[PDB]
Design an enzyme around this catalytic site. Structure first.
Site, PDB file in Angstrom:
ATOM      1  N   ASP A 152      -0.850   3.256   5.537  1.00 28.72           N
ATOM      2  CA  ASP A 152      -1.745   4.166   6.244  1.00 28.72           C
ATOM      3  C   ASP A 152      -2.294   5.244   5.318  1.00 28.72           C
ATOM      4  O   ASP A 152      -3.441   5.673   5.476  1.00 28.72           O
ATOM      5  CB  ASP A 152      -1.016   4.810   7.424  1.00 28.72           C
ATOM      6  CG  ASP A 152      -0.682   3.817   8.519  1.00 28.72           C
ATOM      7  OD1 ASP A 152      -1.196   2.680   8.472  1.00 28.72           O
ATOM      8  OD2 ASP A 152       0.100   4.173   9.426  1.00 28.72           O
ATOM      9  N   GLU A 153      -1.493   5.693   4.354  1.00 31.54           N
ATOM     10  CA  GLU A 153      -1.877   6.763   3.445  1.00 31.54           C
ATOM     11  C   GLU A 153      -2.454   6.261   2.129  1.00 31.54           C
ATOM     12  O   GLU A 153      -2.857   7.078   1.296  1.00 31.54           O
ATOM     13  CB  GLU A 153      -0.676   7.673   3.184  1.00 31.54           C
ATOM     14  CG  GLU A 153      -0.208   8.396   4.432  1.00 31.54           C
ATOM     15  CD  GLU A 153       1.218   8.887   4.328  1.00 31.54           C
ATOM     16  OE1 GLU A 153       1.624   9.319   3.230  1.00 31.54           O
ATOM     17  OE2 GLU A 153       1.935   8.842   5.350  1.00 31.54           O
ATOM     18  N   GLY A 154      -2.496   4.947   1.914  1.00 28.76           N
ATOM     19  CA  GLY A 154      -3.143   4.368   0.753  1.00 28.76           C
ATOM     20  C   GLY A 154      -2.209   3.855  -0.322  1.00 28.76           C
ATOM     21  O   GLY A 154      -2.682   3.190  -1.254  1.00 28.76           O
TER      22      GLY A 154
END
Length: 301
Positions: A242-244
């Site tokens: 989700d955060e990369g």
């Protein structure tokens, strides 16, 4: 001609040393260039080399000679000892990009990858040197010590390094985020805000003890806890996604793949297909899906 059919069947571009190595073998054994290393060291050119021969001419070819512990980045080109599962192949971080180095693996021993050179000439030089130190007859030092002379001289005319490691390999190892259980390494982009990779919350040694308890242990207490510790890792991976930080799912997916237990097949396609596609490595996502689709196999076809 040879180039377009390799990209027809194996969807990848081969380095210069790939084609030069076949020429070197054709000077050795013109009729059967594939078996130029057979009587000497017992190795046979396979994989994309089978396009140059014609045993397969008329999608499913990436799996052809894909051993049990071969990750999508690895593509076998030379096969060896069938008791040990020995084989040599190109390791390739990015499918578009060219192979970063040559590596060998003993599929029936462990999943660990051994970097033996940047090209196949250095790869063969490493194999020859290792074989020469083992005890043998006077003729088998004679027969293979002549092939080293031939290999050395053709490498220099064509100007290929024979060293085990090269500056490019060392530069690549600087960019590796984690060695992985196969110890060959993974490379993913990392931007200015240091987004892209995230390390595992557990070390490699701890991790194997976690996976061992799940697969081979009789304590419904201990195996459920270890299974719950795996879920925590899986839950951390999707926070990272989700955060990369896509690299963590790639590391843990490959670690499960390296463990070899077929219990984790379902969990691996929880990780690597999604990881490879978020990393812009679409083909490697398709590789792993088909390899676990049929993993115990007669590698011939």
């Amino acid at each position: 001609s040879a180039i377009k059919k390799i990209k027809e069947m194996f969807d990848a571009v081969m380095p210069e040393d790939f084609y030069d190595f076949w020429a070197f073998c054709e000077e050795l054994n013109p009729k059967n260039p594939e078996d130029a290393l057979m009587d000497t060291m017992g190795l046979q050119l396979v994989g994309p080399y089978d396009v140059l021969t014609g045993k397969l001419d008329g999608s499913s070819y990436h799996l052809h000679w894909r051993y049990y512990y071969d990750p999508p980045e690895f593509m076998t080109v030379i096969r060896g000892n069938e008791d040990q599962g020995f084989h040599i192949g190109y390791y390739r971080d990015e499918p578009q990009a060219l192979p970063v180095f040559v590596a060998s693996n003993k599929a029936k021993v462990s999943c660990e990858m051994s970097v033996i050179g940047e090209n196949l000439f250095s790869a063969l030089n490493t194999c020859i040197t290792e074989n020469l130190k083992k005890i043998k007859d006077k003729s088998q030092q004679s027969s293979l010590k002549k092939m080293q002379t031939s290999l050395i001289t053709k490498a220099k005319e064509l100007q290929y390094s024979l060293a085990t490691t090269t500056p490019a390999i060392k530069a690549r190892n600087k960019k590796v985020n984690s060695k992985t259980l196969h110890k060959a390494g993974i490379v993913v982009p990392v931007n200015a805000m240091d987004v892209g990779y995230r390390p595992l919350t557990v070390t490699d040694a701890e991790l194997k003890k976690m996976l061992k308890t799940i697969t081979e242990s009789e304590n419904k207490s201990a195996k459920d806890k270890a299974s719950d510790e795996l879920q925590e890792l899986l839950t951390f991976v999707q926070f990272a996604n989700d955060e990369g930080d896509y690299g963590m799912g790639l590391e843990l997916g490959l670690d499960l793949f390296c463990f070899g237990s077929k219990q984790f097949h379902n969990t691996i396609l929880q990780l690597l297909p999604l990881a490879y596609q978020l990393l812009g490595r679409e083909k490697y996502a398709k590789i792993i899906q088909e390899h676990l689709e049929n993993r115990d196999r007669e590698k011939l076809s």
